[PDB]
Design an enzyme around this catalytic site. Structure first.
Site, PDB file in Angstrom:
ATOM      1  N   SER A 170     -36.014  60.381 -33.134  1.00  0.00           N
ATOM      2  CA  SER A 170     -37.117  61.255 -33.249  1.00  0.00           C
ATOM      3  C   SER A 170     -38.131  60.089 -33.981  1.00  0.00           C
ATOM      4  O   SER A 170     -38.133  59.687 -34.792  1.00  0.00           O
ATOM      5  CB  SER A 170     -37.099  62.502 -34.163  1.00  0.00           C
ATOM      6  OG  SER A 170     -36.184  63.408 -33.622  1.00  0.00           O
ATOM      7  N   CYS A 342     -35.864  70.734 -37.557  1.00  0.00           N
ATOM      8  CA  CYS A 342     -35.219  69.424 -37.096  1.00  0.00           C
ATOM      9  C   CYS A 342     -34.356  68.850 -38.344  1.00  0.00           C
ATOM     10  O   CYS A 342     -34.809  69.005 -39.358  1.00  0.00           O
ATOM     11  CB  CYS A 342     -36.578  68.470 -37.002  1.00  0.00           C
ATOM     12  SG  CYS A 342     -35.942  66.957 -36.442  1.00  0.00           S
ATOM     13  N   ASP A 387     -35.397  70.729 -33.012  1.00  0.00           N
ATOM     14  CA  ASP A 387     -34.979  69.285 -32.750  1.00  0.00           C
ATOM     15  C   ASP A 387     -33.753  68.685 -33.590  1.00  0.00           C
ATOM     16  O   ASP A 387     -33.709  68.015 -34.589  1.00  0.00           O
ATOM     17  CB  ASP A 387     -36.163  68.270 -32.871  1.00  0.00           C
ATOM     18  CG  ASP A 387     -36.339  67.284 -31.770  1.00  0.00           C
ATOM     19  OD1 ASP A 387     -35.661  67.692 -30.495  1.00  0.00           O
ATOM     20  OD2 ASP A 387     -36.863  66.316 -31.790  1.00  0.00           O
ATOM     21  N   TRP A 389     -29.621  67.521 -34.188  1.00  0.00           N
ATOM     22  CA  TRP A 389     -28.536  66.856 -33.636  1.00  0.00           C
ATOM     23  C   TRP A 389     -27.328  66.821 -34.726  1.00  0.00           C
ATOM     24  O   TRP A 389     -26.334  66.498 -34.408  1.00  0.00           O
ATOM     25  CB  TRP A 389     -28.799  65.498 -33.542  1.00  0.00           C
ATOM     26  CG  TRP A 389     -29.368  64.830 -34.710  1.00  0.00           C
ATOM     27  CD1 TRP A 389     -28.501  64.151 -35.698  1.00  0.00           C
ATOM     28  CD2 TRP A 389     -30.779  64.726 -35.299  1.00  0.00           C
ATOM     29  NE1 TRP A 389     -29.335  63.838 -36.623  1.00  0.00           N
ATOM     30  CE2 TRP A 389     -30.614  63.920 -36.759  1.00  0.00           C
ATOM     31  CE3 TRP A 389     -31.888  65.230 -34.827  1.00  0.00           C
ATOM     32  CZ2 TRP A 389     -31.726  63.854 -37.265  1.00  0.00           C
ATOM     33  CZ3 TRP A 389     -32.928  65.058 -35.524  1.00  0.00           C
ATOM     34  CH2 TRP A 389     -32.875  64.296 -36.884  1.00  0.00           C
TER      35      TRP A 389
HETATM   36  C1  LIG Z   1     -33.211  64.102 -30.848  1.00  0.00           C
HETATM   37  C2  LIG Z   1     -32.379  63.155 -31.749  1.00  0.00           C
HETATM   38  C3  LIG Z   1     -33.078  62.671 -32.827  1.00  0.00           C
HETATM   39  C4  LIG Z   1     -32.413  62.124 -33.630  1.00  0.00           C
HETATM   40  N1  LIG Z   1     -33.177  61.617 -34.781  1.00  0.00           N
HETATM   41  C5  LIG Z   1     -32.493  60.927 -35.719  1.00  0.00           C
HETATM   42  C6  LIG Z   1     -33.416  60.257 -36.949  1.00  0.00           C
HETATM   43  O1  LIG Z   1     -34.573  60.251 -36.921  1.00  0.00           O
HETATM   44  N2  LIG Z   1     -32.689  59.610 -37.820  1.00  0.00           N
HETATM   45  C7  LIG Z   1     -31.331  59.348 -37.680  1.00  0.00           C
HETATM   46  O2  LIG Z   1     -30.613  58.497 -38.637  1.00  0.00           O
HETATM   47  N3  LIG Z   1     -30.285  59.761 -36.839  1.00  0.00           N
HETATM   48  C8  LIG Z   1     -31.201  60.539 -35.730  1.00  0.00           C
HETATM   49  N4  LIG Z   1     -30.472  61.165 -34.899  1.00  0.00           N
HETATM   50  C9  LIG Z   1     -28.884  60.780 -34.824  1.00  0.00           C
HETATM   51  C10 LIG Z   1     -28.694  59.663 -33.860  1.00  0.00           C
HETATM   52  O3  LIG Z   1     -29.010  59.842 -32.665  1.00  0.00           O
HETATM   53  C11 LIG Z   1     -27.326  59.212 -34.034  1.00  0.00           C
HETATM   54  O4  LIG Z   1     -26.319  60.246 -33.554  1.00  0.00           O
HETATM   55  C12 LIG Z   1     -26.793  58.585 -35.334  1.00  0.00           C
HETATM   56  O5  LIG Z   1     -27.890  57.815 -35.563  1.00  0.00           O
HETATM   57  C13 LIG Z   1     -25.459  57.856 -35.180  1.00  0.00           C
HETATM   58  O6  LIG Z   1     -25.479  56.554 -35.557  1.00  0.00           O
HETATM   59  P1  LIG Z   1     -24.323  55.538 -34.809  1.00  0.00           P
HETATM   60  O7  LIG Z   1     -24.727  55.638 -33.432  1.00  0.00           O
HETATM   61  O8  LIG Z   1     -23.933  54.352 -35.484  1.00  0.00           O
HETATM   62  O9  LIG Z   1     -23.148  56.738 -35.155  1.00  0.00           O
HETATM   63  P2  LIG Z   1     -21.983  56.791 -34.059  1.00  0.00           P
HETATM   64  O10 LIG Z   1     -21.171  55.614 -34.128  1.00  0.00           O
HETATM   65  O11 LIG Z   1     -22.111  57.319 -32.745  1.00  0.00           O
HETATM   66  O12 LIG Z   1     -21.239  57.878 -35.198  1.00  0.00           O
HETATM   67  C14 LIG Z   1     -21.672  59.264 -34.911  1.00  0.00           C
HETATM   68  C15 LIG Z   1     -20.779  59.990 -35.602  1.00  0.00           C
HETATM   69  O13 LIG Z   1     -19.314  60.067 -34.936  1.00  0.00           O
HETATM   70  C16 LIG Z   1     -18.372  60.164 -35.732  1.00  0.00           C
HETATM   71  N5  LIG Z   1     -17.258  59.526 -35.446  1.00  0.00           N
HETATM   72  C17 LIG Z   1     -16.777  58.768 -35.774  1.00  0.00           C
HETATM   73  N6  LIG Z   1     -15.460  58.228 -35.160  1.00  0.00           N
HETATM   74  C18 LIG Z   1     -15.496  59.165 -34.288  1.00  0.00           C
HETATM   75  C19 LIG Z   1     -14.441  59.718 -33.352  1.00  0.00           C
HETATM   76  N7  LIG Z   1     -13.497  58.773 -32.876  1.00  0.00           N
HETATM   77  N8  LIG Z   1     -14.558  60.777 -32.570  1.00  0.00           N
HETATM   78  C20 LIG Z   1     -15.555  61.552 -32.813  1.00  0.00           C
HETATM   79  N9  LIG Z   1     -16.521  61.239 -33.822  1.00  0.00           N
HETATM   80  C21 LIG Z   1     -16.514  60.086 -34.395  1.00  0.00           C
HETATM   81  C22 LIG Z   1     -18.825  59.340 -37.032  1.00  0.00           C
HETATM   82  O14 LIG Z   1     -18.209  60.086 -37.994  1.00  0.00           O
HETATM   83  C23 LIG Z   1     -20.373  59.967 -37.055  1.00  0.00           C
HETATM   84  O15 LIG Z   1     -20.713  61.280 -37.865  1.00  0.00           O
HETATM   85  C24 LIG Z   1     -30.936  61.689 -33.741  1.00  0.00           C
HETATM   86  C25 LIG Z   1     -30.318  62.359 -32.650  1.00  0.00           C
HETATM   87  C26 LIG Z   1     -31.002  63.066 -31.620  1.00  0.00           C
HETATM   88  C27 LIG Z   1     -30.161  63.672 -30.488  1.00  0.00           C
END
Ligand SMILES: Cc1cc2nc3c(=O)[nH]c(=O)nc-3n(C[C@H](O)[C@H](O)[C@H](O)COP(=O)(O)OP(=O)(O)OC[C@H]3O[C@@H](n4cnc5c(N)ncnc54)[C@H](O)[C@@H]3O)c2cc1C
Ligand SMILES: NC(=O)c1ccc[n+]([C@@H]2O[C@H](COP(=O)([O-])OP(=O)(O)OC[C@H]3O[C@@H](n4cnc5c(N)ncnc54)[C@H](OP(=O)(O)O)[C@@H]3O)[C@@H](O)[C@H]2O)c1
Length: 389
Positions: A170, A342, A387, A389
């Site tokens: 966001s 959100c 909004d 997630w």
């Molecule tokens: C509309 C929207 C707005 C957003 N805004 C923000 C924001 O403002 N700030 C923010 O910090 N984030 C925000 N997010 C979240 C962001 O999109 C990511 O999901 C988040 O930042 C994940 O970081 P990453 O990609 O390194 O995590 P990832 O590596 O994708 O990890 C995400 C999650 O997966 C879990 N995970 C780990 N291993 C596995 C596995 N084997 N199987 C399943 N799950 C597992 C982890 O524990 C973790 O909780 C938003 C998401 C959306 C959809």
């Protein structure tokens, strides 16, 4: 052009939002969009393409057996296996059953081959739900359980590992206040899976460590883009608004306050604004205090209500804070107010939703059937936006 597919955007600033007294982290990042066609509106999301940690990539090379220096064409110009494992292979998520079929095909050990075909099979759907999905086992963990499954390089990117997805954020900035920068507010994701793996969030850790051009010119950069969202301020400023984002769900609302502030200088009275924000502790988790006090000081936000997860003895959440101001919430709802939620979808969002059903009747005087329909009508009017997630 340049919306569906990403635009190289260097990172201008990258600052830590928590104090050093916090045991977590949260990163303020600004992408430099100057000289690009990229445009955004208040309430939009930014997609960001990142890459895997080197250690993760090292592990995938170990289990595949490939030469990293091998150049191949990902389904122009070729790429090395090492770079494709980094920017195009989702390594840490759990393999889908089709990926387990692919693996099984190249499992030269018959019991390894049988267990894989089983885990994908219907008679395995229970064990696959527990051992793979429930435990959050990565593709990398699974392949280590079956060292014999050695798929070829084509098969691997074609079937076993799906593409590294872009992470959405966001935008926490309004174009009026900074039409040259996209602001993202991003918490550091760092967990331990039920199976005992320590998982660094993939895009979140990249952002937490991105080198900003404000401190070096080798600055980091990431292919980014913008997705239009319905998370939008009312066309008329006078309309009363309710904002309910705690922790990292503040981000959209920071661009809400920049929008109406920038407008207000040239514009009309903004009318009532109330922001409900929650975080763990005054001296650790409070992201963007001075700016918020500023938005209060200059009338951008009318009122600011906070709950403290863990600072106080009482352990306040935002929904609880809503119950205290329930009668007032209802008045704004009757006045035509829009309501935005959100942040965390599984807990805060749910509890915030439940409070809303419970809170409407206090002055609604409606029973659950009637309260449910009313709050549902707010959603189809466009009045009640989430909004989460
Ligand atoms: C509309 C929207 C707005 C957003 N805004 C923000 C924001 O403002 N700030 C923010 O910090 N984030 C925000 N997010 C979240 C962001 O999109 C990511 O999901 C988040 O930042 C994940 O970081 P990453 O990609 O390194 O995590 P990832 O590596 O994708 O990890 C995400 C999650 O997966 C879990 N995970 C780990 N291993 C596995 C596995 N084997 N199987 C399943 N799950 C597992 C982890 O524990 C973790 O909780 C938003 C998401 C959306 C959809
Ligand atoms: N690495 C991570 O970020 C991480 C790790 C584990 C779980 N999670 C889950 O995912 C969420 C993401 O966190 P974030 O970045 O938004 O910051 P956060 O860690 O959620 O902190 C935001 C505030 O929301 C509060 N909160 C927690 N559960 C709630 C609920 N059911 N209803 C209302 N408020 C609640 C938290 O209180 P308390 O924290 O005091 O309970 C905290 O004060 C967390 O709230 C957590 O439930 C995240």
């Amino acid at each position: 052009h340049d919306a569906q597919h990403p635009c190289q955007a260097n990172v201008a600033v990258r600052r830590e939002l928590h104090t050093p007294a916090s045991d977590r982290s949260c990163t303020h990042l600004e992408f430099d969009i100057a000289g690009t066609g990229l445009t955004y509106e208040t309430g939009d999301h930014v997609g960001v393409y990142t890459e895997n940690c080197p250690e993760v990539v090292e592990e995938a090379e170990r289990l595949l057996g490939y030469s990293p220096d091998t150049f191949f064409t990902i389904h122009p110009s070729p790429i090395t296996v090492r770079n494709a494992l980094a920017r195009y292979a989702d390594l840490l998520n759990s393999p889908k059953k089709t990926s387990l079929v692919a693996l099984a095909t190249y499992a030269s050990d018959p019991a390894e081959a049988d267990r894989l075909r089983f885990l994908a099979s219907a008679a395995g759907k229970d064990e696959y739900a527990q051992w793979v999905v429930a435990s959050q086992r990565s593709l990398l963990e699974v392949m280590a359980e079956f060292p014999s499954a050695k798929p070829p390089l084509g098969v691997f990117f074609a079937a076993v590992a799906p593409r590294l997805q872009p992470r959405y954020y966001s935008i926490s900035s309004s174009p009026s206040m900074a039409a040259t920068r996209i602001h993202v507010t991003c918490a550091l994701v760092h967990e331990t899976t039920p199976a005992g793996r320590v998982h660094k969030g993939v895009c979140s850790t990249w952002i937490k460590n991105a080198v900003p051009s404000e401190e070096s010119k080798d600055c980091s950069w990431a292919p980014i883009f913008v997705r239009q969202s319905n998370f939008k301020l009312p066309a008329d400023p006078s309309v009363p608004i309710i904002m309910i984002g705690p922790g990292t769900g503040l981000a959209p609302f920071r661009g809400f306050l920049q929008e109406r502030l920038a407008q207000k200088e040239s514009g009309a009275e903004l009318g009532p604004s109330v922001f409900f924000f929650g975080c763990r502790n005054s001296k650790m988790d409070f992201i963007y205090e001075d700016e918020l006090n500023n938005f209060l000081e200059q009338g951008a936000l009318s009122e600011l209500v906070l709950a403290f997860s863990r600072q106080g003895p009482t352990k306040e959440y935002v929904q609880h804070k809503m119950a205290q101001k329930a009668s007032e919430i209802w008045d704004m709802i009757s006045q035509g107010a829009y309501i935005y939620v959100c942040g965390d979808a599984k807990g805060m969002a749910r509890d915030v939703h439940r409070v809303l059903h419970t809170i409407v009747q206090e002055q609604g005087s409606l029973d659950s059937s009637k309260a449910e329909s009313f709050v549902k009508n707010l959603q189809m009017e466009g009045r009640y936006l989430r909004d989460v997630w």
